[PDB]
């Protein structure tokens, strides 16, 4: 899946970007802890506002 990052993280750090990460790394450590979030299209625009604004 794509999903956006909230924290820094390792090889994909950017504090906010869409990277094709395996559903295993996301739904297990990333999201289930606070470092990523599923790009349900409703969040990609949500955090997008944080960028500009």
């Amino acid at each position: 899946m794509q999903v956006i990052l909230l924290d820094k993280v390792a090889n994909l750090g950017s504090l906010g970007d869409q990277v094709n990460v395996k559903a295993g790394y996301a739904r297990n450590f990333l999201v289930p802890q606070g470092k990523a979030v599923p790009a349900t299209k409703k969040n990609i625009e949500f955090f997008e506002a944080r960028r500009a604004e």
Binding site: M1, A23, R27, P32, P38, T40
Partner: protein
């Protein structure tokens, strides 16, 4: 019972169609796996015995969206 608590999938009966076409009743046991899901709206590890495909359905809709469908049909977690 080995039945997905989400997709509702359960052991379906079939037949072991061999080379000589010898019918033999069997079953397709779903790939269920007791996984511990975390809910941000409740702060708890809601463990649910769902199949492989049942988990992906939770990724799109959401653990909160899935549970909402459970409490609706009497499902207790």
């Amino acid at each position: 019972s080995r039945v997905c608590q989400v997709t509702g999938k359960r052991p379906v009966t079939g037949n072991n169609r061999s080379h000589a076409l010898n019918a033999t009743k069997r079953r397709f046991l779903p790939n269920l796996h007791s996984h511990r899901f975390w809910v941000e709206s409740e702060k708890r590890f809601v463990t649910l015995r769902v199949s492989a495909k049942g988990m992906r359905v939770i990724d799109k809709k959401g653990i909160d969206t899935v549970l909402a469908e459970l409490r609706a049909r009497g499902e207790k977690y």
